[PDB]
Design an enzyme around this catalytic site. Structure first.
Site, PDB file in Angstrom:
ATOM      1  N   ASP A  34       0.806  -1.217   0.000  1.00  0.00           N
ATOM      2  CA  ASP A  34       0.000   0.000   0.000  1.00  0.00           C
ATOM      3  C   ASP A  34       0.840   1.268   0.000  1.00  0.00           C
ATOM      4  O   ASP A  34       1.340   1.696   1.049  1.00  0.00           O
ATOM      5  CB  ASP A  34      -0.930  -0.017   1.220  1.00  0.00           C
ATOM      6  CG  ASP A  34      -1.894   1.164   1.263  1.00  0.00           C
ATOM      7  OD1 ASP A  34      -2.065   1.914   0.252  1.00  0.00           O
ATOM      8  OD2 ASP A  34      -2.510   1.324   2.323  1.00  0.00           O
ATOM      9  N   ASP A 223      -1.351   5.516  -5.566  1.00  0.00           N
ATOM     10  CA  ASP A 223      -1.852   4.692  -4.457  1.00  0.00           C
ATOM     11  C   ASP A 223      -2.177   3.261  -4.889  1.00  0.00           C
ATOM     12  O   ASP A 223      -3.234   2.998  -5.451  1.00  0.00           O
ATOM     13  CB  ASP A 223      -3.090   5.354  -3.829  1.00  0.00           C
ATOM     14  CG  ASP A 223      -3.572   4.638  -2.563  1.00  0.00           C
ATOM     15  OD1 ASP A 223      -2.897   3.682  -2.147  1.00  0.00           O
ATOM     16  OD2 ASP A 223      -4.617   5.030  -1.991  1.00  0.00           O
TER      17      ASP A 223
HETATM   18  C1  LIG Z   1      -7.194   4.577   0.411  1.00  0.00           C
HETATM   19  N1  LIG Z   1      -6.552   3.609   1.303  1.00  0.00           N
HETATM   20  C2  LIG Z   1      -7.150   3.137   2.445  1.00  0.00           C
HETATM   21  O1  LIG Z   1      -8.273   3.400   2.863  1.00  0.00           O
HETATM   22  C3  LIG Z   1      -6.161   2.140   3.079  1.00  0.00           C
HETATM   23  C4  LIG Z   1      -5.737   2.495   4.523  1.00  0.00           C
HETATM   24  C5  LIG Z   1      -4.554   1.918   5.010  1.00  0.00           C
HETATM   25  C6  LIG Z   1      -4.107   2.168   6.315  1.00  0.00           C
HETATM   26  C7  LIG Z   1      -4.835   3.016   7.158  1.00  0.00           C
HETATM   27  O2  LIG Z   1      -4.500   3.342   8.453  1.00  0.00           O
HETATM   28  C8  LIG Z   1      -3.118   3.330   8.764  1.00  0.00           C
HETATM   29  F1  LIG Z   1      -2.903   4.154   9.807  1.00  0.00           F
HETATM   30  F2  LIG Z   1      -2.819   2.068   9.167  1.00  0.00           F
HETATM   31  C9  LIG Z   1      -6.007   3.601   6.680  1.00  0.00           C
HETATM   32  C10 LIG Z   1      -6.460   3.348   5.378  1.00  0.00           C
HETATM   33  C11 LIG Z   1      -6.848   0.772   3.063  1.00  0.00           C
HETATM   34  C12 LIG Z   1      -7.496   0.249   4.209  1.00  0.00           C
HETATM   35  C13 LIG Z   1      -8.156  -0.982   4.172  1.00  0.00           C
HETATM   36  C14 LIG Z   1      -8.180  -1.698   2.979  1.00  0.00           C
HETATM   37  F3  LIG Z   1      -8.818  -2.878   2.949  1.00  0.00           F
HETATM   38  C15 LIG Z   1      -7.557  -1.197   1.823  1.00  0.00           C
HETATM   39  C16 LIG Z   1      -7.590  -1.943   0.612  1.00  0.00           C
HETATM   40  C17 LIG Z   1      -7.626  -2.590  -0.395  1.00  0.00           C
HETATM   41  C18 LIG Z   1      -7.678  -3.367  -1.637  1.00  0.00           C
HETATM   42  C19 LIG Z   1      -8.282  -2.543  -2.780  1.00  0.00           C
HETATM   43  C20 LIG Z   1      -7.246  -1.587  -3.352  1.00  0.00           C
HETATM   44  F4  LIG Z   1      -6.010  -2.110  -3.071  1.00  0.00           F
HETATM   45  C21 LIG Z   1      -6.897   0.029   1.859  1.00  0.00           C
HETATM   46  N2  LIG Z   1      -5.011   2.212   2.130  1.00  0.00           N
HETATM   47  C22 LIG Z   1      -5.316   3.047   1.185  1.00  0.00           C
HETATM   48  N3  LIG Z   1      -4.448   3.333   0.171  1.00  0.00           N
END
Ligand SMILES: CN1C(=O)[C@@](c2ccc(OC(F)F)cc2)(c2ccc(F)c(C#CCCCF)c2)N=C1N
Length: 368
Positions: A34, A223
């Site tokens: 990611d 992304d």
């Molecule tokens: C937009 N986005 C998300 O919402 C997030 C994410 C990641 C970490 C976070 O919190 C951090 F602090 F750990 C908050 C948001 C994310 C979260 C949950 C998910 F199932 C996915 C996914 C997927 C597969 C489809 C595209 F591959 C992405 N990653 C992205 N790029």
């Protein structure tokens, strides 16, 4: 980098993941790659969508940082406990890193049913780490602790269950066999997300003719953790109008254009040539210079022969998600604060393309 080729797997629309091990003895997990986040955050308690999870109790090398983390966000939320452990990537570099790990104990709409991954590898920068920027991201730890060069590249390949997909994450370098032609580089505007600048957009050669600030309103990012090309409202509406017009020989319901309803043809008959190509022109390394990446309907109609429209509206700026990246070999050259694009190694009339230079004026004014 031979041993890192094909080290990514996923299901269509459910992200790309790499095998990792955490702890001693090593616990094997599948981890979402990611570029749109900055935490190494792993399932660490039972969850209905998780068939395995990180067990801190089982690791001799786990160290508790004795602080919690709570992450509410737009689509969902998660809660966890911070600590460190040894981390390896079996089909990555031959090294082991002591990394920060957020052990997720509670979550809502975070994990995806059937995705086959149990955590997220946040590859972006410390500025957007949670709870704050003092929590060193994985890649930063990797570079600081080992001799691995400060760069990684991603070849995300396309292609009843959801279709399986594959690709490669090359850590510490660029694998020339994964691309053809030239690598064109766009500056990383700021080290938080992988923020870039789009200076113009064409649909089938036709300029959208918008003030370039609109393309980056309020930011533009690369992304891998987003499926779609997401576009700011005004740009989205302009784009769909243009795509509707080009594909007018056929009629589709509003549900399709809103990316929520699938559209089908009998196996093999997909009329690719009625759908236009889309070119995004990215700011070049040289002032007044840009280059374009050109994507086909084969990228933006996502297989579910049934397809969903994988271009959608954003209120948080442009997101160049998996369906942009799938056309290309994408180099995250952190060392030189730049992102490279070349045509990926992975129809009869059209091809994805990366082409430059193109002279576009006042590119710094496109920011915001
Ligand atoms: C937009 N986005 C998300 O919402 C997030 C994410 C990641 C970490 C976070 O919190 C951090 F602090 F750990 C908050 C948001 C994310 C979260 C949950 C998910 F199932 C996915 C996914 C997927 C597969 C489809 C595209 F591959 C992405 N990653 C992205 N790029």
């Amino acid at each position: 980098f031979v041993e890192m080729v094909d080290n990514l797997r996923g299901k269509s629309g459910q992200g790309y993941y790499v095998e990792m091990t955490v702890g001693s003895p090593p616990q094997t997990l599948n981890i979402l790659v990611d570029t749109g986040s900055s935490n190494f955050a792993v399932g660490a308690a039972p969850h209905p969508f998780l068939h395995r999870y990180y067990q801190r109790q089982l690791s001799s090398t786990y160290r508790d940082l004795r602080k919690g983390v709570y992450v509410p966000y737009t689509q969902g939320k998660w809660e966890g406990e911070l600590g460190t452990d040894l981390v390896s990537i079996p089909h990555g570099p031959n090294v082991t890193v002591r990394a920060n790990i957020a052990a997720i104990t509670e979550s809502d709409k975070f994990f995806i049913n059937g995705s086959n991954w149990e955590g997220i590898l946040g590859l972006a920068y410390a500025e957007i780490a949670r709870p704050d920027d003092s929590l060193e991201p994985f890649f930063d730890s990797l570079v600081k602790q080992t001799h691995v060069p400060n760069l990684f590249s991603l070849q995300l390949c396309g292609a009843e269950v959801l279709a399986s997909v594959g690709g490669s994450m090359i850590i510490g370098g660029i694998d020339h066999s994964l691309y053809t032609g030239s690598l064109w580089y766009t500056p990383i505007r700021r080290e938080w997300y992988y923020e870039v600048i789009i200076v113009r957009v064409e649909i089938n050669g036709q300029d959208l003719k918008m003030d370039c600030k609109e393309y980056n309103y309020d930011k533009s990012i690369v992304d891998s953790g987003t499926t779609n090309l997401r576009l700011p409202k005004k740009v989205f509406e302009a784009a769909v109008k243009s795509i509707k017009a080009a594909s007018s020989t056929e009629k589709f319901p509003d549900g399709f254009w809103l990316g929520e309803q699938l559209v089908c043809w009998q196996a093999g008959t997909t009329p690719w040539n009625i759908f236009p190509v889309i070119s995004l022109y990215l700011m070049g390394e040289v002032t007044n210079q840009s280059f374009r990446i050109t994507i086909l309907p084969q990228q933006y109609l996502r297989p579910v022969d049934c397809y969903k429209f994988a271009i959608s509206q954003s209120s948080t700026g442009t997101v160049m998600g998996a369906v942009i990246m799938e056309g290309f070999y994408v180099v995250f050259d952190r060392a030189r604060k730049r992102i490279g694009f070349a045509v990926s190694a992975c129809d009869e009339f059209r091809t994805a393309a990366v082409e430059g230079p193109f002279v576009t004026l006042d590119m710094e004014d496109c920011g915001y």
